[model samples]
Target: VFRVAVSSMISPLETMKGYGPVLSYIEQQTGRKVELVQRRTYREVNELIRENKIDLAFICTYSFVEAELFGARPVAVPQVEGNPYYQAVVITRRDSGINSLEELRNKRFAFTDPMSFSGHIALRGELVKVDRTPETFFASTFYTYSHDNSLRAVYDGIVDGATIDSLVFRSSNILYPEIGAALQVVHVSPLVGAPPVVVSPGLSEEDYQLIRRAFLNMHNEPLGKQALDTLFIDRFVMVNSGHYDYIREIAGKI
Candidate 1:
């Protein structure tokens, strides 16, 4: 049996819609029991991998680098929209009268998670430009814990502004056009490495290669391609361990 967990990057319902099919494919191809675990935070999922409680997972690149220090590594990285890089998009309600990060001062902001680079770290990096930290720049903050929730907070006017994975913002917008038109992006951070498909140190080399091949060719397989398309992933691309260097630099600033 192989235990593979995934954090709530978006939401539980959407997660199953996007990642379920592909994971099922991995299970059938490997003839292994692929147990999908769901946790509350990206940090917890990382811990699951670190403790060898799970065999592997897809995780935020920022946390994955830290996971490497704890005996986890990426065997594959997804190509989101044919690119291996993504951004943190700062957004506000279309009618919020907010224009940029500077205008977000003294306004309520929803952060997905403290451990999220795209949802929190990059937002801090942007504030540092004006000599401010999250506490000083925003009137108050709340943790939504999931990018989709953060985005919804902005859309529903529960918060004045928020930042989230650009890919999440875009995919959500595409999936829900009405909500998509309700918010406008004010800023986009420098591109960071895409999230990674990470594995535990306890995983065997042979199984590692097999899992990697499954993802690499996922797009060429009928069911896998459909699943990848649902997730907005073009394919899984090989990335060197150093692929997350840019993200490390961004997180180091916070």
Candidate 2:
């Protein structure tokens, strides 16, 4: 842990601005400086973790499975409402006259990435239930790479419908209230395991324990609590690897 680097998916939030304080707090607690690694996409960052390009990362549930092959271990996962879980929300413009998935059939839709569980997998899983794929079920489809962008497309009438992470949607009102006024939730996907703090194989046990404790007790501090509130998180907890195995199962079906 002498040379530590922390990374996250690019610009994952609104007023939250990304995991600024969380990573900084880790550096302080571990008595080590964190070199922040910036990646253009979730998959790119995940790949870096696979190659041991970085010491630590906050990666998607889908990518976590792949990172497992390279000794990526979870130290903490965000807790919302006391659960280490999240759900994707299907949204459309409030006045789009789209109250149900059936109404959106043959309409344009927005997704994040192929590797995004809430933004892509969960959305696809729902479509499978009704026997459809984006190719034929929607008039057109595109990837925005960011949940806010997907929701913004709906607000700006760029797309007829979009699905995004519920946590991202809920906290986005902080920077863009028009999104809250414009987008309507037509469906809520089943709960999925939250993203996690993944560490490289080279990290020592002492380093991981420090990292874990820093996150678990972060919300108790004033600055840390503010950061958590900005990100719409309640707290962080140590989660088992099995917490994300179901994501691999969901991806297989998709």
Candidate 3:
């Protein structure tokens, strides 16, 4: 069996909708049955990679950077709408009257995960610019643990603000227009590498090549193209590990 894990950046239901067909294609092309694993945190997904418990994973960019320290390496990155980069998008309810990050001081904030670049590190990097931290800046803060949840928190006025993945924010707006109507983006961070498709260090060279080929060609086949479209991906391309240095730098700052 070919084991794979996916981190829940979105809700589990949405994650399945986005990845299920892609995994089916991987199985068909690679001639291996896939066992899908779902984990709640990027940290847990990273641990699976480090332990070689799974052959592959779709993980957050920040987690991929940290996972590389322990022998995990990226095999592919999805090109979304012609770019392989995404950003942090800070948002609040449309009626919140907040226009900037500085204006959110001492207000409630929802973070997706501490290990998330878009959802957490990006905001921390911004705070560092003004010599502040989440703990010291926000009056109250909580981890929603998933970008979708963080977005919902802002939409429902459950939190004063939140920083989330730009791709998630954009897709959520498309998928749930009503949510979009209720929220407004306050800040956007500099572009960083998008999340990656990673392989375990234990994967053999032959299997690695097979998996890589399957991903790169996923947009060519009709079924694969449909899957890519469902996930808002144009195609899977070779991962340029260097593209993640910006995230490493931001992580270093915060």
Candidate 4:
């Protein structure tokens, strides 16, 4: 059996719905029985890759850099709008007075996951520029562990503001049409390489090539194209490791 784990960037149900078809395509192409695994946090998924317990994973950018130390490697990167980059977006209720990260001082904040680049690290970097930490800058901070939950926290006024993936923010609106109307984006981070689909170092060359090709060719077939659309990806392309060095630099500082 081929085991694939996904970090909970979105809610579990939404993750399944978004990734199911792509996993099925892999199964059909490789003749391998597939099992989909979900972990509550990015670290848990990284551990599975490090231990070689899972064959593949869809993980956050910073988590990918950390996982590379454990011999995990990215096979493909999703390209959106012809680019393999994304951004972090800080959001607040439309009616909230918090129009910038500086304004959120001493206010409650929600972060998706500690290892998430867009959800946590990017926002932290902004605060660090002003010599502030989450502990000193915000009155309180909590982890929702998934971007969708972080977005919802801001939408429901549960937090003064929350940071999440710009891509996730767009999709969340599709899931709940009214969400975009009630929320306003306060800040957007500089673009970083998008999250990647990676494989364990222990994987055999045969399986690696099979999985890599499946992704690289996914956009060419009707069914696979449909799957890509569900995930809001244009296509998967072979990625250069250098694409993530910028993220590595940011991660090192935080």
Candidate 5:
């Protein structure tokens, strides 16, 4: 039995259900028992990869970087409308009086997680551009761990602002309407590639290719198409390991 770990970035039960049909198809085609190992946080997921508790994982960009640093490589990345990138949105209440990143200085800011690209790195990179470091700029900082919590923290005035994945925000707006209605984008980070689906280096090359093919071909099937629609993902692409260098560099800087 091969255990594939998945992140909590998306709804766990729902995500597993979405991928269940595809995994079933893969099992039927390949004669392998694929089991999902779900984790509650990125740190836990990465730690599992590091400890060899998981054979492969669908990790975020930052976790992917951490995995590569710790010996894992991405075999696929989710693509939307044929593109493999998503952005980070820095949002504030429309009446918060914050129109730009500069306005966020000295204000309370919520980050999703320390290891999140859209939640942390991209926002940190943007702050670096404005000559403000996270350490010196925000009056105080906090992590909500989940993007939704970060958004709600800002919306509820617990924090003046927050950064989160744009794709997640868009999807959540439709599926979970309350959180979406309370905030507005103050700024959006440049498009960073969608979080890659990574496999541990321990997996045989053949298994890696198999999983990659499964993800790439997922949308062509009815169940896969429904899952992708739920995720707002139209398809996936096989990207080389090099696509993440930018994220690695940003990680180093932050």
Candidate 6:
């Protein structure tokens, strides 16, 4: 039996509904009982991976680094438009008079979470490049725990600015226009690869192989194709554990 942990950006039940078919297919193909363990937050999910409570998990780049520190390895990464990566976006309301990272200095800033790569690490790294650290740079620093709250904080003027995953911001704009139009991008971070699907160190070689094969070949299955579309994924691809070293390096610096 294997347990899978997923993020709470979407409800666990909804995620399971969308991806359950793929899980079921994997179980049938590999003859292993796969259970979905939904976590309430990214931090919780990361803890589960680190503790080896979950055999496999889908985690963001930063969370992947945390897992790697505990001996997890990337087995697959979701592919989008032929690329296995995405970027971070710094945003503010158009009329808020915020235009750049420098403009944010001495102003209230919102981070999604310390563990969020696109929402915190990448943005903070950019600040460091400008010779400013979050400790002394911002007038105030706050974490919303959810990217939605970060966006809302900026929109409601609770914070002068915030950073968020570009893909999440774009998708929200498409599905929830009111929230999307509430903010505008003031800066864009360089691309970071997509979050990975990982397996714990305890998984057997054969189990890992089964997961890799299932993820890589998922697009060929009708339900898998539908699942990919629903998640805004174009496909899946093989990825290496070393792909997230950049995140780890930046995290240490911060």
The candidate maximizing TM-score is 3
Mind giving the per-residue lDDT tens digits that candidate 4 earns over 129-248? 898889999999999987877877888888999999988787778767787779988888887888999999799988889889999999998888978977877999887778778677
Q: Per model, how many backbone clashes are there?
A: 0, 0, 0, 0, 0, 0
Residue 178 in candidate 1, Cα distance off native in Å: 0.9
Return the TM-score for each candidate structure. 0.94, 0.90, 0.95, 0.94, 0.87, 0.87
Candidate models: Cα lDDT each = 0.81, 0.77, 0.85, 0.85, 0.77, 0.79
Instruction: Candidate 5: list runs displaced more than 4 Å.
Output: 9-11, 14-30
The residue pairs in collision within model 1 are none
Off by over 4 Å in 3: 9-18
> Which consecutive 10 residues in model 3 have the weakest lDDT in total?
9-18
lDDT of 6: 0.79
lDDT of model 3 at position 178: 85
CA displacement after TM-score superposition, residue 240 of candidate 4 (Å)? 2.6
Q: lDDT by residue for model 6 over 213-238, one digit each (tens)?
A: 88888898886776675566778898
Residue-pair clash count for candidate 6:
0
Distance (Å) between predicted and true CA of 162, model 2? 0.8
lDDT of 2 by residue, 18-85 (tens): 66666556666777776777764677877777777777787777777888777887878889877888
Worst 10-residue stretch by lDDT in candidate 1?
9-18
Residue 125: error of model 3 in Å? 0.7
TM-score of 6: 0.87
For model 5, what is the error of residue 162's alpha carbon versus the real structure, in angstroms, after optimal superposition?
A: 0.6
Q: List the residue pairs that clash in candidate 4.
A: none
lDDT of 1 by residue, 1-39 (tens): 888888775433464346677677787768897777888
